[PDB]
Amino acid sequence: RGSDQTVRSVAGDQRVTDPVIVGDNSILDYYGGSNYDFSNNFEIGRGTLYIGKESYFSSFQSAPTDVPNSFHLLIKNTNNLQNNGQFIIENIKRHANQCSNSSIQVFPINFQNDGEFEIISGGVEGRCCLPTSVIAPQNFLNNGKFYYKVLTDTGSIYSGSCMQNVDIGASTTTTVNNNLWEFTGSINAQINGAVSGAAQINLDGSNMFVNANTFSGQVVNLINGGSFLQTSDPLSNIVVINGLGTSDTGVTSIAVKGKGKSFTYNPSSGIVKLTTVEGKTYAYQIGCGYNTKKFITNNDSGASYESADNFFVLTYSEPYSPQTCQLE
Ligand SMILES: [Cl-]
Ligand code: NA
Numbered sequence: 001r002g003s004d005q006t007v008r009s010v011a012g013d014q015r016v017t018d019p020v021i022v023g024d025n026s027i028l029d030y031y032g033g034s035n036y037d038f039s040n041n042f043e044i045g046r047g048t049l050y051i052g053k054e055s056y057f058s059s060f061q062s063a064p065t066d067v068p069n070s071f072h073l074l075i076k077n078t079n080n081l082q083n084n085g086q087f088i089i090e091n092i093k094r095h096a097n098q099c100s101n102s103s104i105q106v107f108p109i110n111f112q113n114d115g116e117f118e119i120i121s122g123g124v125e126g127r128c129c130l131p132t133s134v135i136a137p138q139n140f141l142n143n144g145k146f147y148y149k150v151l152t153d154t155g156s157i158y159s160g161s162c163m164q165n166v167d168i169g170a171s172t173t174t175t176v177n178n179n180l181w182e183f184t185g186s187i188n189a190q191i192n193g194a195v196s197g198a199a200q201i202n203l204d205g206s207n208m209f210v211n212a213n214t215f216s217g218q219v220v221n222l223i224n225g226g227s228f229l230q231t232s233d234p235l236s237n238i239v240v241i242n243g244l245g246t247s248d249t250g251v252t253s254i255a256v257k258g259k260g261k262s263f264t265y266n267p268s269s270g271i272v273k274l275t276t277v278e279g280k281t282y283a284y285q286i287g288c289g290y291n292t293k294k295f296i297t298n299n300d301s302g303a304s305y306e307s308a309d310n311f312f313v314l315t316y317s318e319p320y321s322p323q324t325c326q327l328e
Contacts (some may be wrong), residue, residue, distance in 0.1 A: 003025060004024075005025050005026070006026035006027070006175045007026070007029070008028045008029065009027075009056070009057065010028070011031060012033045013034060014030060014035075015037050016037070016038045016039070016040065019042070019043065019049060020038065020041070020043070021047055021295075022048070022049050022085065022308060023191070024040075024047055024085075025047060026056075026142065027047055027050065027056060027086035028048070028049050028050065029057060029136045030051045031055040031056065031058075032053065032055070033067075034068050034070040034071065035072050036074070036325065037073075037074045037144055038075045038077075039076060039077040039078060039109060041079055042075075042080070042081040042082060042083070042084075042088075042108075045081065045084050046084055047085045049083075049085070049086070049103065050291075051090075052087075052088065052089065052091070053097060054068065054090070054094050057235075058094065062094065067093065067310045068130070069098055069101065071091040072101075072102070072103070072226060073089060073103045073106075075106045076105065076107045076108075078108035078109065080112075081108040081111040081157040083112070083113050083114060084115050085116075087272055088119075089104060089118070089119045089120070091131065093124060093154075094256060095153055095319045096122075097127070097133070098124070098127065099127070100128035100249070102132070103133070104119065104121075104131070104132065106134065107134075108137050108138075109138045110138065111137035112143070113141070113142045113143065113146060114143045114144050115143045115145075115148065116226075117145070117147070118145075118148075119135075119147070119148045119166075120144075120148070120149050120152070121150050121151075121152055122151060122152070122160075122206045123151065123158030123160060123164070123186055124153060125158070125160050127163070128161065128248070129160045129162055129164065130162060131236055133165070134168045135167070136167065136169050136173050136193065138173050139239070140169065140174070140175040140264070141178075141252040142172065142177045142178060142181070142197075142243065143179055144179055145179060145180045145181075145182070146182070147181075147182075147254065148181075148189070149184040150185030150186050153239045161299060162186060162306070163206075163305070163306040165188050166188065166189050166190065167188065168189060168264070169194065169212070170213075171192065172193070174193070175193055175194060175195045175308055176195075176197040177198075177199035179198045179199055180199060180287065181202070181203070182201070182202040182204065182205040183204065183226075184205065184208060185205055185217075186235055187206040187207070189206060189207065189270075191209060191210050191212055192211050194212055194214035196217055197215045197216075197217045197218070199217060199219070200219045200220075200222060201229065202220050203220065203223060203227065204223040207248070207305050208226075208229065208230060209218065210228070210230040210239075211231045211257065213232050213233070215232075216235070216317075218327070220253045221243050221244065222241065222243035223244045224250050225251055226243070226252055227253040227255060228254050228255070229256070229305060229307070229311060230255070230282060234281060234282045238285045239283060239284050240285045241254055241320070242320075244286050244320060245316050245318060245321070246317050247319045247320070251315055253313050253314065254272075254286070255305070256310055257309050257311060257312075258278055258280065259312055260274070260275075260276065261276055261279075262275045265286075265292050267292065268327050268328060269288070269325060271284070271286075271291060272283050272286050276312055280298065287325075288326070289322045291318070295315070296314075296315045296316065296317055297312065297313065297314055297315075314319065
């Protein structure tokens with residue numbers, strides 16, 4: 001060969017009380033089990049930690065394995081989770097046409113992600129997969145990439161009904177995002193704790209709900225019909241939201257809790273202001289290049305977003321086409 005390489009491939013349920021240490025050029029493949037419970041530290045180098053229903057080493061053309069379609073991961077009482085490599089969690093049983101009985105609960109005191117953290121969850125067309133997924137370290141520091149994808153039992157993106165609720169943060173936690181979040185497929189990302197830093201969040205067909213009172217430094221990009229929704233009272237900061245428009249890739253939207261009273265858009269500043277009947281005004285930076293006459297506003301029950309909250313919804317009837325702002 002020439003270089004070092006370690007592969008640990010470990011089948012079945014695991015109750016892990018020792019530290020999880022993955023070296024550089026090393027892969028630790030926990031697979032097959034229905035119950036995973038970790039309670040000590042994680043030190044992931046420039047290698048891969050994989051926890052999933054199918055082995056990391058299985059492929060598109062692999063025969064099914066006789067494991068239950070059930071996947072429960074708990075990380076709790078862990079003091080430190082440090083990821084410098086790839087950390088993948090996947091609940092999908094290949095070629096199963098039932099939803100996994102699945103829960104993911106990630107509650108380490110500290111989670112520092114310097115590499116890639118990816119969660120892959122199954123959706124099934126015609127079914128309604130709604131697994132439990134809570135990512136709420138007391139302290140979450142993302143210097144790398146946090147991907148959440150909902151895929152079919154063969155690995156294509158799932159875009160159907162049953163938006164999977166993914167709780168990110170909690171009322172006491174602190175999240176700093178300094179690089180990238182990307183949520184792909186039928187995901188309702190519930191941002192339930194404070195987020196600060198300087199980062200991008202890509203919503204590829206997904207919905208993100210800003211439910212907390214601190215959401216700063218985060219630029220949001222709406223792709224393939226993704227939507228930004230805010231349920232908390234207006235933020236002091238003007239959130240940047242790119243991609244509002246209508247194309248054949250979908251209709252993206254921006255929505256604020258309540259019922260619409262009015263809106264104003266300044267084509268020389270890029271700021272749109274949405275005012276609700278209760279008198280709350282939400283300000284967002286959507287870019288210059290929009291024609292005020294082509295905005296559309298509606299009230300929604302929430303059902304279009306698989307929410308129970310009423311929303312005042314802003315859309316735009318032509319494609320996203322940003323321009324540089326000019327006062328003129
Ligand atoms: Cl749910
Ligand atoms: Na409602």
